[model samples]
Target: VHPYDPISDAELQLTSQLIKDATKGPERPHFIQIDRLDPPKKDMIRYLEAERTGKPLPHISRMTYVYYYIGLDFYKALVNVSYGHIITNQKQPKGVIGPLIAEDIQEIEELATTHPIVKAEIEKLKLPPHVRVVCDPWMNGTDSKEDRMLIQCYMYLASAAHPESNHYSLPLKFSPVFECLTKKFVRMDYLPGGADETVTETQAWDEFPFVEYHPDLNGETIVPLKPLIVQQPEGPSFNVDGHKISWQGWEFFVIPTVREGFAIYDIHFKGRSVVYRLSLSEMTVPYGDPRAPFHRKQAFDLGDCGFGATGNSLALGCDCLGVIKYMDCRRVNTNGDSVLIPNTVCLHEQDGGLLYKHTNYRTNVPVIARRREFVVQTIATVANYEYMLNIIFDQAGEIRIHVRATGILSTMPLDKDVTVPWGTNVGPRVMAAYHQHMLSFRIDPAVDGYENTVVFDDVIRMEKNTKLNPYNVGFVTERTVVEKPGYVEQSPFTNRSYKIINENKINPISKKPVAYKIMMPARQMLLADEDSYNNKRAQFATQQVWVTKYRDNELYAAGEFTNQSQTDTGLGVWARRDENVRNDNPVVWATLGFTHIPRVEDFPVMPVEAHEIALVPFGFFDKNPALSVPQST
Candidate 1:
């Protein structure tokens, strides 16, 4: 079995008690984040090989620890797990500290109209933890821990709008607390006052000048949506034994670990090896603002927080649509015991509308084929946004790694409309801060075994007076190899496209090398200053593509430790070696994503913003792979 698993439950309780008992004076730990300290990759690889070879198991080491944010005190602290001390196990003081998001909740609940309404409703019900403030988690934005880890809050409210009673819709811009982050609250010289807890019906978010959305005020219900139906009879085409999955012509070992969200190894199509390994190595979300604290709003989600640890169990029927095959995930908990997150992986075939179509001009005969996409997906809610990552295998022998970004936009309150030039003012007092970063994927392709070459075939326009072109432009295909380990951006000016070819293998028809082309349509790498704190930490996003010689230790793009990284580590460290990458064991890093400036339509829940990088076969087969598809149903 793959030793990687979800954090256990009993372990969490134990750690919670440990931290509570250990918490000292002045600081009150509230939102405790328990996580699995991932086992070393080098050790895990050896263990996996031993398991596959049927040899004695290698050493499997696991660790679980926790850190928490403290409040209702003088300072806001991200207190990591402490050592060298011990404390009691008895029922400790409730400590009288507030919930992690209590301040935000209290802020929203105090909005003159919405606040009074919410307190009245939840009070009538006498609910414990009656107020809920939902938003994104804190992230390290800048290089300096003090500057980056410091968080400021802004919110959109979903108030108690009972359908049976008078109120029947979610509310927003509800209110703000006097002192939240720490006991000291500076209203700020830039802005006159902090977020006000008093706002009359005239300033209500749903009112005309304030706002005007009340479609669900009379409410049947506003959250649920239509169902997606996917039918499969004798179970799904995929089979799961431990983490190994066998689907159509695809078979691979799946690993959803504490560090990397999900990964696939030894992927085979039609009983032949195609990809040796694939996974999202690292991702950085850098905010766009010139202001002091906002400048520190950059975040390396994967490095600061493990993908698997943060990826809680997914929702059923809703998260995955139709005849889904889901596997519960496993990882050690705080006490170091394997735990499962139910239905953590979803496998299903998605309808891709039309696959291909053609008509016989002579006979007027038309033939068409419908497209089906077999996808293995997992999603993690990193703060306010959720990133749904997928390993998609299509009938045409193409593999596409995709990510769909959804959920609420991360925002904060602003003093002036001067913020309008800084970020989108999604609401009256909110700035859904603009941000950018490339979500880089690491793919180690072993086409027909391990040695492969990276080549780019450029399409350049011929000059107007050229002999081959009577007009201003004609195109030419010229191939170039990526001989050295380094970063390279897309040259759309040349209309460039790249392929990882097996120089040792030749195709019978095209007489060219068999290969798989990297096709990513998302451009603009990390747009931060090349030397900026946020940019260097995620330097992997500086280019659209990277080809480096394979090395087990060089899996992460941003380096080993992203939590408090001072400079670039992984990608730059290895690539700076400048080794020969052509016709060797080469690994490809593809970066994809775009800048987000929130709009009004994105309120409540934003639509899914997705990107795809298809590993399309280039001369790997004699004819078109999808030609084998059957005509119309």
Candidate 2:
């Protein structure tokens, strides 16, 4: 029989009030009695004597008292017989027995701390209040079996609520918080693996004039020093299905457009039978080297060229096409008109921009260096894909470049198709538009003779396509195929020949005295060997160790299990055996296993798992260890 469907509101309120009142008192009154075992006559008489004299008695031995008072209640509020009868049909006992024992021990210790008989001893000892004899309703004896058992049970309950417990107190909620805080605090300085946000721009040209030279189809040398729109004759004719067609096109030529009195070549040159190619190579310049001497004077050898005029010069001449024929002395002049020049100048190469001997050149240095920064924002698309939009900034410091990328653009291969929402697969088109936008601002500092310009020499690299594994398909199918099992049944047997006339049949089989032999298969349950069983148990117990050891030793240990002198001594075997033996030792084993217990005193409240994170200044600070400081107590 159980109580009513739901406890009445009055009953619940009364229960709560009773608990509050019980806790308010100095000490809850509890009743004690011998319940498990009947107290002996002699023990009862001694207890009576002690009660009369108001003195402690050893008549009822500690063990007898422990068993007798196991469930006796010391708190009077919990002992309400009416409530118990109403709720459970059993008379409720007053007080909890363990807390009562703890209170008794606390009283004895406190009395001894100030008592004349124990005062001298107590004065000579140093003890803290936590450990000092205080009246507790939960702790019992100093060192006894009964005391240990009660303490153990109480500790088990308390540790359940403590964070120190191996198992999580509140598993569902604490795990994610613990993991996040652990990563945030324990590995605070861990940088995300990626490239730096700042892009380095190295420019090459500053004040060098480009020249063009080439013969036309008529073998006439033409050098257009100014902007001109020229039309060439239609020389070729093709008969396509009785239709005659001629190939002819218009050519746009320019020396250089002068902006702020500085000639700037902002053009993409194109022509028939005129190929313009540029090769770029990088070199590290040693520090403290003579800049002009190492590059212009010694390395370039501009004197070999037929031009000899001194001090910052700019030669503006073009051949029949886009090639530059000659330049003023100081900068290198190639014998052939088509020659590649160093794109960017280093400090150890030349002083500032390109300098040459000028015959009669005017200087107009243009502003070459410009900067832009942008923020990258992201949004998720359908099916494990993401859209990243990097907002770009223009000369006005306004976000002008909006580059959108898809998950498919990632270098890693995707297992499934990822598409944009609203049935759009236009990521590549968007990327192409973004690329054109980037090219729109492509300022070739190389042409301007400025040493700092964005170079597209090695911007993005394409990876080789991986070869497909032909065997994978067949292998998977074969491995997954399974065979169905066949069925079997037993047939009933009826035998009459050997049973009734067993003695007669034996006599008939042998003329001499009948001889009969009974044979039965051995019926012993085979027991596994102790050592083998123990070894298997150990192997199962430390399976992780075996996995790590195998991965670290057999597979990763230099080579295929070879007989090298280093590995021939069987030292690996000895080491593994020693480790296993050490792990099996009782003390070590107990320590490893005892980490799971929880205690009772840790109820209602628990300590939070501690975590912290900090960002420290890098390089801008002094020595690394200089960050450590002594704490003030």
Candidate 3:
């Protein structure tokens, strides 16, 4: 059983609302800046105890370290952990969830304003009597707040029609804070003077300034040109029993948990084991701009806040547009109650490109085969960004890992013409943060069996011959075995490929070692300071490819306790063993990264930024595996 810890709805809602009772005149905390704290060691030790007793699931006590963005202060609540109980919907046991003064404030409002901005322009902007103001620090991917405490604020002006209405996102702007409020400066010499204009544009302000916010897409409707549908056979071929899945001569077990999210175990092809395990191990996104808090703007998402913990329940036609088959997964709340999440995984088949095609010149007859793939996908909404994990298994005994990132760009609102060298001005009043999303996948290939080695294979130009009409017109291939536990970088010039080779097995047709190749089709690695806390924790992120010997309790790339850690504990720590990886049971880790400097079109919802990695049979198969299948089906 995969144990988990999460906050439940009733208990969590109570904690969030209980903070409304915490206030000192104007001093209040706007909460939900809570984090998952480690469970008591003794408490987990008892889980085994209850299992021994055969009770109806052991009760796991879950608690959260409640904190909030209280205008000028955060993590200043000075509260211990909180407990959510079943009976009475027990709420905050220690810390605050939200503030009393801003009970009406929208939790995640855009255009965050500063405290100084709200008080100074409260009357000038004609803020309603019940409108609440909230502020958030200008820190993303950062863990430090020491001297960098600059903040941006937002206003939740109830409703225009009803002053007493609690409805959020009132049609208004918080521009007054910039005009006269005492703003905070980043550099000592810089002065944030009166740099404000019409913060809010009325319906009548459409005189000349091309206000794109209110654009009229009135006359045209953008819809699909033709009807598209994806149908399946009589029934699903992929039979799932618990986590185990078997279909198309492929078999594996999928585990969708709160900690690691979606991972497949014991991947086999043609009733033979290929990969003992495969998973998107862990990831870190480090912001590049080292301006104060931005220096600490590094996020260890998978470790700090479990990616699976934030996984969203997928919808039907909206998520997977085909004759879909969904797998339901179960995770628990912090209260240890079973909460089943349906459609967490969407499985289906897709028609890819041509699998095989060859023309017989003499006979004028061609043999062709189209490609079909089985797709397994899961999506995690980590706050502002959406991360999708798609595993495409093709008919050629190849596995392609494609990660698609799309959602609202994590950006801060701009006042006027603010020159941001570290970021791009995605909108008139928006500067999208320049960041890197680096993800690493763990590949435990048992190609023909577990004892496998990593071999570096790349195409190199031929050297000039000694005497026999040397023209260097041909190319030579290099096959170098990874003899050490070091890392390998991708060489684009040669279009390199690495193979997990099984020394004990040899391909009969190729007359070579049987192997599964890894080809990524890239940012090299993390550009953050090597000595930074985030960089250390995600040390695996510093390399495009890393080969280390298999070790227990090493499922995570960035060691498991990564929430505000100081040093490397996962990949970096394990690699120091320096065990012989050549022809050893090696675990291959590949990091895929993409840089996002937001475009103007990515203002509201960013289009998918996809990076793909593929693994095919190098010498493992005699020919294309799909050639044996019937052409029609």
For residue 162, model 2's alpha carbon misses the true position, in angstroms, by 30
Worst 10 residues of 1 by lDDT: 162-171
lDDT of 1: 0.62
Task: Please estimate how well model 3 matches the true structure, expressed as its whole-model Cα lDDT.
Answer: 0.59
lDDT of each structure? 0.62, 0.18, 0.59
Q: RMSD of candidate 1 to the true fold?
A: 8.3
Query: For residues 411-452, what per-residue lDDT tens digits would candidate 2 score against the true structure?
Result: 110011332211122221110000100000111111111111
Give the per-residue lDDT of model 3 (tens digit) for 287-311. 7654443355565667655556566
Q: Which candidate is the best by lDDT?
A: 1
Model 2 scores a C-alpha lDDT of 0.18
**Arrange candidates by lDDT, highest first: which order?**
1, 3, 2
Q: Between the candidate structures 1 and 2, which one is better when assessed by lDDT?
A: 1
Q: Please report, as a residue range, the 10-residue window in candidate 3 with the lowest summed lDDT.
A: 202-211
Model 2 regions more than 4 Å off: 1-109, 115-117, 124-633
TM-score of every candidate relative to the true structure? 0.73, 0.15, 0.71
RMSD of each: 8.3, 44.3, 9.3
